[PDB]
Amino acid sequence: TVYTFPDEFKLGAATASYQIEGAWDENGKGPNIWDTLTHEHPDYVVDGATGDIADDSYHLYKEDVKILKELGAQVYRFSISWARVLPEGHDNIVNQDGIDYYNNLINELLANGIEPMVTMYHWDLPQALQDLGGWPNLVLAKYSENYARVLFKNFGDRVKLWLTFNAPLTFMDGYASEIGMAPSINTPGIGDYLAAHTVIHAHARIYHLYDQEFRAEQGGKVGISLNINWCEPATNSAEDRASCENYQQFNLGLYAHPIFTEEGDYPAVLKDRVSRNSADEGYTDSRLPQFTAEEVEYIRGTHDFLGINFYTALLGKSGVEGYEPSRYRDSGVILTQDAAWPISASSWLKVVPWGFRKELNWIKNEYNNPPVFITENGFSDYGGLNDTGRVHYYTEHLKEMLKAIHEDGVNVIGYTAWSLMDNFEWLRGYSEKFGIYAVDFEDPARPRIPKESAKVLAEIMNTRKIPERFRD
Numbered sequence: 001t002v003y004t005f006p007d008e009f010k011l012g013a014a015t016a017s018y019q020i021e022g023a024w025d026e027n028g029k030g031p032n033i034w035d036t037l038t039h040e041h042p043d044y045v046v047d048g049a050t051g052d053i054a055d056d057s058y059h060l061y062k063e064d065v066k067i068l069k070e071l072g073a074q075v076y077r078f079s080i081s082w083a084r085v086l087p088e089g090h091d092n093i094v095n096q097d098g099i100d101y102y103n104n105l106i107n108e109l110l111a112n113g114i115e116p117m118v119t120m121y122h123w124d125l126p127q128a129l130q131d132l133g134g135w136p137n138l139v140l141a142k143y144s145e146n147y148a149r150v151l152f153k154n155f156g157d158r159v160k161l162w163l164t165f166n167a168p169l170t171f172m173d174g175y176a177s178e179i180g181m182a183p184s185i186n187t188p189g190i191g192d193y194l195a196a197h198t199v200i201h202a203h204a205r206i207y208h209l210y211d212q213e214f215r216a217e218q219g220g221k222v223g224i225s226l227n228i229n230w231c232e233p234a235t236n237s238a239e240d241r242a243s244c245e246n247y248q249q250f251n252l253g254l255y256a257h258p259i260f261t262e263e264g265d266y267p268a269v270l271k272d273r274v275s276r277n278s279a280d281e282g283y284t285d286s287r288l289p290q291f292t293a294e295e296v297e298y299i300r301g302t303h304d305f306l307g308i309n310f311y312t313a314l315l316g317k318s319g320v321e322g323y324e325p326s327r328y329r330d331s332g333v334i335l336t337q338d339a340a341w342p343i344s345a346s347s348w349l350k351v352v353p354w355g356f357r358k359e360l361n362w363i364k365n366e367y368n369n370p371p372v373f374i375t376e377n378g379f380s381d382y383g384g385l386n387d388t389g390r391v392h393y394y395t396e397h398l399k400e401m402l403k404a405i406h407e408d409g410v411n412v413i414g415y416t417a418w419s420l421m422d423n424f425e426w427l428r429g430y431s432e433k434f435g436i437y438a439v440d441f442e443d444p445a446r447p448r449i450p451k452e453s454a455k456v457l458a459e460i461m462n463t464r465k466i467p468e469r470f471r472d
């Protein structure tokens, strides 16, 4: 039983637009902040890589569907490129080529018995909107509503699973470093909080839009994908436990407390620690933006499920470190990783499968057991088809998730592996491989070929259980 997937549980794989599509300026697509970063600042990216071609999924989407069908995916999670649909960011011009592209992909999936799950925003903001300040500027919440309306109108007759945003905890950091994630602006502890605030408002507008304009007709579900690491106390002390609770609230709770609790608003510890630190540094006003009571009520409850991107764990101990001002410093935890944990090709990603079960329980307890869809989970290496590390990563994480479901009563409803194929890994370029299919980026045809992990995942998807040879 503990090794079998529930009958209705959905298994599949995931990608994101900039990471796979290419065709960055083809057929009317406008520029986004990742076009800008990779073109203007190749020094920020391993190898000076760009997403100009990537997996060429703009042209090769039928090949993506073919490998999804081979894998036996029930669901394909992909994102829509805002600037491919609305090249100016604003909704005055809709690019028919972009509409056609996503319709073609959706229709191809459905014809092959694969359900589309669509992320509206996976980090590729139109440059025209960044030029207004991007996410720190609250005007983007209405712009995001208008973008979502175009998506619901054009695609919602066939798409029944939506994510407003992907991993805003990560993309907000594009406002916390001059050399980091797009748009690479150095406003740590100030602009990243403003970005989060706008994202939360935008998410809520999109959910209410669905309720008002689309749900009765379309009957789908709208969630948000939040990334979160487990944070294990470095020792069993109450002080180290407090630091790990701080971590959860400053990383997951920042987004999930406003949306997924009955109370709404930011977590108290976030409000209070930032208020205190801001006062002590001489600011008249807290660096953390505020919601009014009306906004708190508007935002809370704006969910049909919770998407989670889970990869790894950290150790947390009591204390404060980091630069003033910064979210890490504000969070009141000292973070490390255990040298004993298996490594990957990504400095931040260690293999800690039991952390997944701990995180799922933390979520269950904090948010009253929301339906949870694992929208990403996966592992990096530098190359190779005999990807034993990736196979082990998947089989262990899936076992831990199944324990969370069967032993712990966590309402996990689906899981999409990150990623269907090797792709553009942001500032790491093509150097870090997350795919279950390999892609030859030196071959203009970008063939996708299965790794051992794709074969094992296909076996899991076909049999709906963890094979005996991977059991404890």
Ligand SMILES: OC[C@H]1O[C@@H](O)[C@H](O)[C@@H](O)[C@@H]1O
Binding pocket: 016, 019, 166, 167, 227, 309, 376, 418, 425, 434
């Ligand atoms: O870093 C690995 C992956 O983690 C995620 O949380 C992001 O959504 C992906 O775009 C990224 O490729």
Ligand SMILES: [Cl-]
Binding pocket: 235, 236, 237
């Ligand atoms: Cl101890």
Ligand SMILES: [Cl-]
Binding pocket: 468, 469
């Ligand atoms: Cl066997």
Ligand code: NA
Binding pocket: 094, 150, 153, 154
């Ligand atoms: Na339209």
